[PDB]
């Protein structure tokens, strides 16, 4: 995160850390959606240009974390994956279209003051909130500048209109993506940045005041550049896919 602040404790209890056993190191962010299911960016697992192809055995999922680096002895819970599921039509060859994946935990995690799932949007929730101008919140332990924070960082950013999104870049933008950030005029800064990938873009419903995950940190060019925006996986558009695997494989 760029230009964000330290999270308060228990502010984002669905925040997960994707963790490499060896070298043990931070892979990406992720989110807890139930006691056995984690949502991440498919590019955190599979990205051939960079020679990335993780298997279950390669990873650890860390939940209830605050510190980037320490093992939080009576707070965090570490889990093993039972299974990874990537969007069959994820496009790693051109634009990261459908950048989403689900991870099934070996054993269900117990909820706590620090560990609690986020909701998945519904058509009407998506309808009223996914609006240009409306702000969302991003969290992660990624790069501070286009180095690494000691504690979880948070930033609030406004949703931007499709055309502006589209005119900011040469990559082909699809309906499975939205972009967020301030306009250079606007004069407020903030962005996600490398290492933030796979983390949640959440909004708080003013109707039932629950936290909903609208997006997943996906890609950008640079971090906090003026005239540029972060891109996120549009979670609602991909809901059915999600519905499908949970319903065909777990819970």
């Amino acid at each position: 995160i760029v230009e964000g602040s330290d999270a308060e404790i228990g502010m984002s209890p669905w925040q997960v850390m994707l963790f490499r056993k060896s070298p043990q190191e931070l892979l990406c962010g992720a989110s807890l959606i139930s006691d056995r299911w984690v949502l991440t960016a498919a590019h955190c697992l599979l990205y051939p240009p960079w020679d990335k192809n993780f298997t279950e055995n390669d990873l650890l999922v860390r939940i209830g974390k605050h510190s980037r680096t320490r093992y939080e002895r009576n707070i965090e819970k570490i889990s093993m994956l039972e299974k990874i599921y990537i969007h069959p039509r994820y496009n790693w060859r051109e634009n990261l279209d459908r950048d989403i994946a689900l991870m099934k935990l070996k054993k269900p995690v117990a909820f706590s003051d620090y560990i609690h799932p986020v909701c998945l949007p519904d058509r009407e929730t998506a309808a009223s909130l996914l609006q240009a101008g409306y702000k969302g919140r991003v969290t992660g332990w990624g790069n501070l500048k286009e180095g690494q924070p000691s504690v979880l960082q948070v930033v609030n950013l406004p949703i931007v209109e499709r055309p502006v999104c589209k005119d900011s870049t040469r990559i082909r933008i699809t309906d499975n993506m939205f972009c967020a950030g301030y306009k250079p005029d606007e004069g407020k800064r903030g962005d996600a940045c490398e290492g933030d990938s796979g983390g949640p873009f959440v909004m708080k419903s003013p109707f039932n005041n629950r936290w909903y995950q609208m997006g997943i940190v996906s890609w950008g060019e640079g971090c906090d550049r003026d005239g540029k925006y972060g891109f996120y996986t549009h979670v609602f558009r991909l809901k059915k896919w999600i519905q499908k695997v949970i319903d065909q494989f777990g819970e």
Partner: peptide, 25 residues
Amino acid sequence: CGLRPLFEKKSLEDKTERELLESYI
């Protein structure tokens, strides 16, 4: 889902959630 133990649950608000809510016209 989405109701945080240390916040919604005790009816406490985080330091910047209002910036969110105020943007929802």
